[PDB]
Design a protein around this nucleic acid. Structure first.
Ligand SMILES: [Ca+2]
Ligand SMILES: [Mn+2]
Ligand SMILES: [Mn+2]
Ligand SMILES: [Mn+2]
Ligand SMILES: [Mn+2]
Length: 344
DNA sequence: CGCTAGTGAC
DNA sequence: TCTCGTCACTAGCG
């Protein structure tokens, strides 16, 4: 998520209701509803007890969307990006640490305070996601597991004209160049739509309303793919790009301290990190549901060597990616767990 | 004065 | 998804 991007571009925000997209197709970032659902039953989950509160929690929103004549497409995360591997394992070890410190020191030492480190160690496994997938398919709702980060898949679905809007709580979707994003949506169906075309309504934004410059801004302000520089946020980065006239972004990144009148020394690794972050936002591997193949988010431009974009995802055979997308193949063990076929 | 980053609570 | 988010504070930079 981008730090307070929603508040920054408020002028481009529009309070709507889901009824706006009646008789239309909308993709859904199911991970948000999954995470929000894994709270009211977090205890029973971490104890090792079969609970399905999060399932009904997601199906609440699903049936809510169905009640307004909308066709939802639930999208899930798949293989972890090669760049976010170490972060994943780190957060994993942190959750293991909380789980370890919340089993003996809080169950015998401070019994009255056990659900402290017992609720801060939650992980959305593929098993839970699949448990949601079954219940969703049982209602005739289409499901699609992304080959990697669901963000890029949703972005594709929106940019390909397959879906009209993207329902999420993650601010990263805006940086991917989505045309329609519905945030902060409650159980009743009231959310905030951000149309890309209306990005020009933001006076504070300046001439940073183009997809490329907006992307550069989101990356420079800090994101999952790259951490922000010290004393750098949305305003200062936006100012950097707004006061920039150079076609080449690299030189601007080098002169960032010169544009902001700040004593900032640019790290050599930060440049490459920026290049990789941008190439990840641009050419992250997604799954085409129509042509049934594994393609990047956008078409490769002239200034990019596709054989160097390993961090943005690695290619697999179309049949394998097809079995991943359907949810039939386990992400970890790479074996078939289901025999679901969309043509039968 | 504004921005950034870090703290405190639901 | 660096509580998950929200906002007031606020310290501290420039
Ligand atoms: Ca300019
Ligand atoms: Mn993120
Ligand atoms: Mn894979
Ligand atoms: Mn995501
Ligand atoms: Mn994201």
């Amino acid at each position: 998520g981008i730090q307070g991007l929603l508040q920054f571009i408020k002028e481009a925000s529009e309070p709507i209701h889901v009824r706006k997209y009646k008789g239309q197709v909308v993709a859904v970032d199911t991970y948000c509803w999954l995470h929000k659902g894994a709270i009211a039953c977090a205890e029973k989950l971490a104890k090792g007890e079969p609970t399905d509160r999060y399932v009904g929690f997601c199906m609440k929103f699903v049936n809510m969307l169905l009640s307004h004549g909308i066709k939802p497409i639930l999208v899930f995360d798949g293989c972890t990006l090669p760049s976010k591997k170490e972060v994943e394992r780190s957060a994993r070890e942190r959750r293991q640490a909380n789980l370890l410190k919340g089993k003996q020191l809080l169950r015998e030492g401070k019994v009255s305070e056990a659900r402290e480190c017992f609720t801060r160690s939650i992980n959305i496994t593929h098993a839970m996601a699949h448990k949601v997938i079954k219940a969703a398919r049982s209602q005739g709702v289409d499901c699609l597991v992304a080959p990697y980060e669901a963000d890029a898949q949703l972005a594709y679905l929106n940019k390909a004209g397959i879906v009209q809007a993207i329902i999420t709580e993650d601010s990263d979707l805006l940086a991917f160049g989505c045309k329609k994003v519905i945030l902060k949506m409650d159980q009743f169906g009231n959310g905030l739509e951000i149309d890309q075309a209306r990005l020009g309504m933001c006076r504070q934004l300046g001439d940073v309303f183009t997809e490329e410059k907006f992307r550069y801004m989101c990356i420079l302000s800090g994101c999952d793919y790259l951490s922000s520089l010290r004393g750098i946020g949305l305003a200062k980065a936006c100012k950097v790009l707004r006061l920039a006239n150079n076609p080449d972004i690299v030189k601007v990144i080098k002169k960032i301290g010169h544009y902001l009148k700040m004593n900032i020394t640019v790290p050599e690794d930060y440049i490459n990190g920026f290049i990789r972050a941008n190439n990840t936002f641009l050419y992250q591997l997604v799954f085409d549901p129509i042509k049934r193949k594994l393609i990047p988010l956008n078409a490769y431009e002239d200034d990019v060597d596709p054989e160097t974009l390993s961090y943005a995802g690695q290619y697999v055979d179309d049949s394998i990616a097809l079995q991943i997308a359907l949810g039939n193949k386990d992400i970890n063990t790479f074996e078939q767990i289901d025999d679901y076929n969309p043509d039968t």
